[PDB]
Amino acid sequence: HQGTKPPRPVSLESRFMNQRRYDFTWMHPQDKFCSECRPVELECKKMCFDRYRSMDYRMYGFQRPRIQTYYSFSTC
Amino acid sequence: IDPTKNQWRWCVDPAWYGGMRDKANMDMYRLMVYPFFGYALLYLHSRFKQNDKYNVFAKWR
Amino acid sequence: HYHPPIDKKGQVYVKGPNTVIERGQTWIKGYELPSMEYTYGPKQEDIPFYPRVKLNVWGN
Amino acid sequence: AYNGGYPFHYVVQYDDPNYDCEADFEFEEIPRDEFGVPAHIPPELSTQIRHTYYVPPQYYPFLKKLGEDTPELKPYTDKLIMGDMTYDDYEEMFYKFAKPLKIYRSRLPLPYRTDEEISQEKYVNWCGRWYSYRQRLQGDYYSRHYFRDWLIGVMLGMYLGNLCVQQHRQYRVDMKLFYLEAPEHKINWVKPRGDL
Amino acid sequence: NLEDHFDLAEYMMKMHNPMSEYLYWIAGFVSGLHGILPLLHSNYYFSGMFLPRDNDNTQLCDDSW
Amino acid sequence: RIGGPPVFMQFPPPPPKEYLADGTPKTYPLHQPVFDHGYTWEHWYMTNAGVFHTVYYGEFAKDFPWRWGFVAEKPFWVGAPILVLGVLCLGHIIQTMGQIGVRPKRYTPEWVEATKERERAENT
Amino acid sequence: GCEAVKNPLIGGPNQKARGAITSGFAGGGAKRLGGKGYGIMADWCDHGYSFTKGQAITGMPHWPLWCGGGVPDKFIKIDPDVHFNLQGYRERIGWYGFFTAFLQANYHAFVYFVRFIPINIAIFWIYVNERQREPQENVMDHEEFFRDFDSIYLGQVFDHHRFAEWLARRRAVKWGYADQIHIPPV
Amino acid sequence: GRELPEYVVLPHNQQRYGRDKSYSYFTCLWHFPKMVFTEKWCYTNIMWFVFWTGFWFIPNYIWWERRYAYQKAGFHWEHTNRKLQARKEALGMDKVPASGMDW
Amino acid sequence: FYILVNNNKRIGIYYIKLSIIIGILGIVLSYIIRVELYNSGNRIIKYDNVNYYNMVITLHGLLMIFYIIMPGLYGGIPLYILPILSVITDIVLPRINNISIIIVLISYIVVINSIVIEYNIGTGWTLYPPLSIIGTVIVNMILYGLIIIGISSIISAINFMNILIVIDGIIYVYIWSIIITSVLLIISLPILNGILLMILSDIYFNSIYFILNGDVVLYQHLFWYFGHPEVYILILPAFGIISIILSVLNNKIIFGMKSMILAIIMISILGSIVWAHHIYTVGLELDTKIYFNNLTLIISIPTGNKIYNWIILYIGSYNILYNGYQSLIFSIMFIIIFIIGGITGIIISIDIIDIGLHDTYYIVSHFHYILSIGAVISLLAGILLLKDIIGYYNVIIKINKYFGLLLFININIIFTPQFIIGFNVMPRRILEYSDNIIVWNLISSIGSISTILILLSIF
């Protein structure tokens, strides 16, 4: 079920939604990877990792299609 | 088995029942005292510098 | 400097009491502490009188 | 009635003389209990079976001598001779003949007291009773005096409190006349300052 | 041993080295400085003076000194 | 329990006494000074020594420094009142040293009058 | 420094003369390998049950508590007289001996880490295996979702294999690898 | 079992220790600094503490200063990016292979 | 050794020693505050450095509460006599006792280091959000200190509770006082930790509990659910000491021992359910306000019973015994002073009176009379009673009538005027004020400098 979780509507940014006082850096106090992305926001991190790779900095993850990997639980 | 030959139970603290092994562990950690002081002092310097507290006089000169 | 104090028989040195047999009875004379002048200095004379009185209890 | 009936310490027997429960990893040997009951016979059944101690017959004359010298011990010895003594019977015999250790006060050395001092014991007891009599009476006397005094404090605290009641009373009278008669009260007087 | 009967035997028997007392007082003195020194440092950092002159944040008479 | 921490043990004898080469007993540091001053008063106080006993505790002037010997010699109600005023006066003096000559403009007569005008207008 | 450090041995003669006891192994007296003995019989090596050989090396521990008792003198190997009396032990063991003793003092902590690490490796494998995969499409356009609510919201329960294939094709379109992958037919 | 005498006569005849001399309120103001600068055991313990604390402060200080300067220059990827633009300028190529990879 | 010692009596001495050291920093901060408040203007803090004053008042409060009085009355005297009162050889958990004092020292070093290195800003000792969560890193450091202190407090509470399992004699009133404080800690600390973690989450983990649609009043509930039990965790050990001193020095058996014990238990239960009297002005519902006001006034009943039981202990005592001992004077002074603090507490308990007196110096004087005067004097009196057992010397305190008189007079000069300015009114946590409040502020300031001078005469 989690491997094929249905897409959900993009959240409208309501009155009290997505409030930020400072960037997200508690996971990487010194490196400060993906300061704009949230700790487990996988799609934001993927695009952020792509920027770093385009800047000659290697990052791990978000490159193999799900159906071409083992244990994905997303194969037909 | 002789009850009077186990007096090390109360003559020696449990933390040092291991003889040299237990004394060595304490001694090794003892050797790290001054390295810790330098490390801790560096952190104070790091915060002191990052807050621009060294430029107290240069700021108004 | 490991040195077990207790001996083979599970005994340690113990100092006995001052025993004094008398009147067909074995007595023990207790050890009285030295005069407080020796330990503190003031001469133990002209001591104010504080009588024995049982505890001051509220009654009724 | 302790530890669920499991004895803290118990005997186990093994048929093979060279068997070791820690070195061997075979799966055919069956351990026995102290009476020799194989482990595959459950406790509920084996505990019902009656087990009695069998001593070699050469001991019968000794067990007979014990009974005669101590007649109270004879019934237990007879059971043992006749092979009718269970473990419970042995326990009853064991605890029946256990006696407590005795302390003799006549052997205690006494703190030293002169014969002159020993003759004054009644006098000192007499002084102690009079001290307890005087203590008990004084308790009633003091309780009456001080708890009565506390009333003076109540009355002093009621007088001082009443002083502030009177001040408060006059204050309320004055307040009622402020908006009614006091020239200090002014209306159509304060004008807005305006922004600076 | 008789020397080990009392905790802190040297101090209780009045033989301790006075340096121990001096260190205790020095430690307290250093603790006190943690309230005064940062006061002076912060005042200079944001003003340029280690300590103010009474009522120097308000209007003063011409002859005030 | 055989071979366990003994309930009671006798003290071993103290180490040998030390004499100086001339035979004078060797003295060791002692923090019980004999202060030098002219005060010789001796104050005694009945003290609780448990439930049924007391002890007559004495304080000797030579056991105290000069400052305490001087103060403790006088009657309490002679010294106490003077000390109370003195401490208060000193506190005010200390707190006045940093404001010598400070003359804020809001305490001048002109500003004092202007506040009175404001109070009259606002019926304060 | 001392002979014991130069020639490490377990339970030899002349222990006091050798100057130190280098082995933490205590007990013995078993008549066979892996058999019932006295003492606890714990060491960094040559104790317990051998996995490769499938054989017991030492018997189960004989605790100095209610369940067991003392060790006979015939089989005692850590003499307290030599085990203690650490006066000038550093000179007897040398610097490498000091390092050895420190490492050997942490057998308890080592035993724990050998039992604790494996499960944590397994948990870490879950993370690594997932991090490699492209993110699933958590969200889509708000409007388009509600214009096809039933298909999207309920497609999974009605037919999960076709819903899985549809999701895969959308991922291939969202990340621009549709022409580089062949999505298996359902 | 050890045998000891009741008393021992010392070789020297110096009465080094004894009762304190009468002290005033501010006696500590001069006695304490005197001990620090005149008693060996005091100033050898101070120098030892200062030397080794500073000794281990240096390597940490050097490491952090280099790290701090680096962090101010930019993020890790901003540094690698500057080296990538330089390599693109050296070759005159708009797009170059990523580091560790061929053309 | 010094740091390795596990002796429970040695550790008790360490707690008192550290409380005095940290106390020097506490008193210095208090002198800064009173100096500043001597007149209107800037005196020792620049107008551009007003953030320092906010930090001074914040650290003063935190240090005196958690690093001085609590380590002194719940760590110092307790660790020294409790195992003796319980006729037990030593404390149940020796190794835990050692680490507790070390933890306190390490958290103190973190706090003071944060003064030196971090930017100096303040948010009160009550760390109300959102102000606490929009500050600089010094707030993060203070949070670490509190959490670390919480660890030491809870483990020490566990240590004292285990005495019930080993006590070989009778549970005296003092032992009951510590046990109940330990219970109050075990029940209140876990709630504090949770709310502190939420402050951290908003400071350091981008949480949103204290931003709109999240109720900031939530923090005040959880904080004060620990806050008020804390004020009784700080006073109950003092009550236990007062009972011992009065009975011993007057040679009189405690009267109503069971009522004393049951009064302490009652205060604890009630103190665990009255916290919102600190939140009267937020705008709580009428029925909530009435509940809390009603239960707050009930606490006076058990507290009153203890006071009167103490009075009869001193009444009737023999005249021949000298009554000028400092310990006896301090114990008597506690009754006289505590009644003042408690009565003013009942006044502020009425919420309508509280509207006028919230966040004013009347509240300051109220809790100073109980803590800065009552608790301090109780700790002094307890240490003084144990002077022979502890064995300290080189001070002139045991019989010093001048010190007691000067302290009592001058301490009242500081805080009695703070009751007056509460109806003037002078807000709390401010440094500048209107010129018409100088007189009373000046008088209190003269009192502060004088008290400090009297602290030098003891040596």
Ligand SMILES: CCCCCCCCCCCCCCCCCC(=O)OC[C@H](COP(=O)([O-])OCC(O)COP(=O)([O-])OC[C@@H](COC(=O)CCCCCCCCCCCCCCCCC)OC(=O)CCCCCCCCCCCCCCCCC)OC(=O)CCCCCCCCCCCCCCCCC
């Ligand atoms: C609220 C206040 C008023 C209260 C009034 C009411 C009081 C009522 C009564 C209360 C009574 C409570 C119960 C008392 C029980 C006493 C029991 C006792 O005595 O235990 C024995 C215990 C130890 O005696 P023992 O058994 O002989 O110990 C032997 C040793 O273990 C072994 O001996 P050792 O010689 O081998 O010792 C080792 C020694 C070796 O020592 C040496 O070698 C010392 C060498 C000389 C050094 C001297 C200091 C140098 C400083 C230089 C500074 C330079 C600054 C330059 C600035 C330049 C600027 C341009 O030390 C060390 O190695 C370590 C020392 C560590 C501690 C000192 C730390 C100092 C502060 C450090 C601050 C660092 C900040 C860093 C920041 C970094 C930021 C990046 O006594 C003490 O420790 C002394 C206690 C003294 C007071 C007792 C209470 C008396 C009554 C109260 C009086 C009033 C006090 C008021 C508070 C203080 C005000 C300031």
Ligand code: HEA
């Ligand atoms: C140990 C310290 C301590 C103690 C014992 C108390 C005890 C009490 N406190 Fe507390 N209080 C504080 C420390 C303490 N307090 C602190 C530090 C604050 C401020 C924290 C902050 O805001 O930052 C505070 C704040 C505080 C407020 C907040 C006011 C405001 O925020 O505006 C209130 C009001 O309810 C209050 C009430 C009480 C009451 C009703 C008692 C009762 O316990 C008093 C009971 C005692 C008596 C009543 C006298 C003895 C009894 C008798 C003589 C019997 C006869 C009397 C009657 C019948 C009434 N306290």
Ligand code: HEA
């Ligand atoms: C128990 C804690 C405690 C103690 C002792 C004190 C003591 C004193 N406090 Fe207190 N104070 C607080 C706790 C305490 N305070 C708290 C919690 C606040 C509110 C914080 C906030 O607003 O955020 C506060 C606020 C506060 C303010 C308000 C500043 C403001 O917010 O605007 C002021 C100044 O007016 C002040 C002054 C003083 C003075 C002059 C003393 C004393 O100096 C008076 C003189 C007494 C002594 C000098 C003796 C003290 C000695 C010891 C404490 C050591 C005892 C140790 C042993 C006996 C071993 N305090």
Ligand SMILES: [O-][O-]
């Ligand atoms: O707080 O009362």
Ligand SMILES: [Cu+2]
């Ligand atoms: Cu409260």
Ligand SMILES: [K+]
């Ligand atoms: K001011």
